[PDB]
Amino acid sequence: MRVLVTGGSGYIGSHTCVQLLQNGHDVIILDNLCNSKRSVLPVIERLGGKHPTFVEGDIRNEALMTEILHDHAIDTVIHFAGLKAVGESVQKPLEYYDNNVNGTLRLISAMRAANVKNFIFSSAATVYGDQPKIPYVESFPTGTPQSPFGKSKLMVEQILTDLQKAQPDWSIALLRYFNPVGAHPSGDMGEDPQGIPNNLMPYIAQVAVGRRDSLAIFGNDYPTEDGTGVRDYIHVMDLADGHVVAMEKLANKPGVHIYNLGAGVGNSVLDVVNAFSKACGKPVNYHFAPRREGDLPAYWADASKADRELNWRVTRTLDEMAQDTWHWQSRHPQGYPD
């Protein structure tokens, strides 16, 4: 298939692109490089075993989007582009709504213009809001995210749903990611956060690599087995693979296909720490800090639907998620070159 991958040079998009190329699709990456570097492109080509086309541009540029879609005769679009720092979003709402809500609107409008009606959106478990019923199931009604970031994702899901209602031939997948971690097995590609990492794993990795002193565990008083937060960590490769399948199976299948993408099991902060200590052969230093604003105690996905409907399920373990991250972190301490 001819697929446009927005945000294709980012963390999850890069991994998905390698998988797409492996399944022999023709990939065109669209990224503005605000959060990634061109240095990854060669790696994606190599690991993918095929050349993906790269266009530096912004999803907010509707005219460019339209031209791209036509010029490359795109069949389907995978939309990972956007801003995603939760904390930042609170301090800078406009930027989030613009890049995520308007960004997606400009892209789908371009799609409409170019007659492209196959779409896959990067959504997030935050859309469920403060849902006491766990695991989270797709049929649960959505909640109210507590940040501009989460609200921006929910708003896009709403808009896409309404778009489909109005243009029923559209096939739109809302892929709600859980907690993506891990890296390509080669250890040549991985998450490359600039500045302080906001997520657990990368933070751990930086402490482990000697860049940071101790990991601050946000809260030790939650109602969980060990008192620390619990989440559903999913390997970036399993996510990559899930996007490939979603894209292949759902193309031309009209509707709004919602799927949780996670392992379907929860792991606490200590569990992750322990898994990393084991992978890097030394104890990861850590300390207990206060609860982080907005954090829910525990949640994980109910991923049976993607299993049943797409025959998709995670295959990598927590150990591998820790090991693969350690490998990349260790093999590329300075991340992708400038």
**CB closer to ligand NAD out of 153 and 327:** 153
Q: Are strands 255-261 and 171-177 parallel, antiparallel or unpaired?
A: parallel
Q: Are strands 2-6 and 286-289 parallel, antiparallel or unpaired?
A: unpaired
Binding status of residue 33 toward ligand NAD by CB under 6 A: yes
Minimum distance from residue 267 beta carbon to Na ion (Å): 23
Binding status of residue 124 toward ligand UPG by CB under 6 A: yes
Binding status of residue 125 toward ligand UPG by CB under 6 A: yes
| Radius of gyration of the chain, Cα coordinates, nearest whole angstrom | 19
Among 207, 269, 275, 303, binds ligand UPG (CB under 6 A): 269
Size of the site for ligand UPG (CB under 6 A): 20
Among 231, 235, 243, 257, binds ligand UPG (CB under 6 A): 231
Size of the site for its own copies (CB under 8 A): 22
Binding status of residue 147 toward ligand UPG by CB under 6 A: no
Cα angle: 5, vertex 303, 244; to 5 degrees? 25
Minimum distance from residue 2 beta carbon to its own copies (Å): 23
Residues 35-54 within binding reach of ligand NAD (CB under 6 A): 35-36
- Closest residue to ligand UPG in the complex (CB): 229
Whole-angstrom Cα distance, residue 203 to residue 273?
10
Binding status of residue 102 toward its own copies by CB under 8 A: yes
Among 151, 153, 184, 327, binds its own copies (CB under 8 A): 151
Binding status of residue 306 toward its own copies by CB under 8 A: no
Which span (4-12, 110-118, 288-296, 300-308) binds ligand NAD, by CB under 6 A?
A: 4-12
Angle 269-280/318-331 helices, nearest 10 degrees? 50
Among 15, 50, 72, 84, binds ligand UPG (CB under 6 A): 84
Residues 89-108 within binding reach of ligand NAD (CB under 6 A): 99, 103
Residues 155-174 within binding reach of its own copies (CB under 8 A): 155, 158-159, 162-163, 165-166
- Interacting residue ranges for ligand NAD, rule: CB under 6 A: 6-7, 9-13, 31-36, 58-60, 80-84, 99, 103, 122, 124, 177, 180, 199
